[PDB]
Amino acid sequence: LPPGWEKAMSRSSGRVYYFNHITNASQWERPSEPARVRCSHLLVKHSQSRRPSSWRQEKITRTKEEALELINGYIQKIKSGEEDFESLASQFSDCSSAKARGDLGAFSRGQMQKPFEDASFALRTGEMSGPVFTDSGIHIILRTE
Numbered sequence: 001l002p003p004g005w006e007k008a009m010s011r012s013s014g015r016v017y018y019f020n021h022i023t024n025a026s027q028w029e030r031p032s033e034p035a036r037v038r039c040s041h042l043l044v045k046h047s048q049s050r051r052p053s054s055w056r057q058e059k060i061t062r063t064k065e066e067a068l069e070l071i072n073g074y075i076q077k078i079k080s081g082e083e084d085f086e087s088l089a090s091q092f093s094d095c096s097s098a099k100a101r102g103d104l105g106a107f108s109r110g111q112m113q114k115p116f117e118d119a120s121f122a123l124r125t126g127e128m129s130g131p132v133f134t135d136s137g138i139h140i141i142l143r144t145e
């Protein structure tokens, strides 16, 4: 299996699925390095973020648990097609990159926070992460290039 993937069993259904311990992605189908990648992200900050402040809120007070719940809800709506990633990032990302639909541009290893970097480079082009934790908060990462 490609880097980071492992087999798992659904508790509610008993069906096998695949989970990536670098990106926290999970999916039913069997999963299918460049100098640089390009990613977008949706950041949800929490009270223990390195800077608990954003363009949405002068004082971010939500707990890490609450931020994870919000991230999980956004992932559900993206996966169902009810909402697009770019739309949720523009409206609800606590990163200033919200104004660019979450786009961060292209980057190399050694530039981003390590959990973010590792998830970004383990995604295939077009793939989306699960919740990724950094000192900034909790991220949904979309690899675009």
Ligand SMILES: CN1CCCN(c2ccccc2CO)CC1
Pocket: 095, 096, 097, 098, 099, 100, 103, 104, 105
């Ligand atoms: C990564 N950080 C430093 C760079 C500035 N950021 C940004 C802000 C507003 C629009 C676009 C971007 C990057 O695409 C993101 C924060």
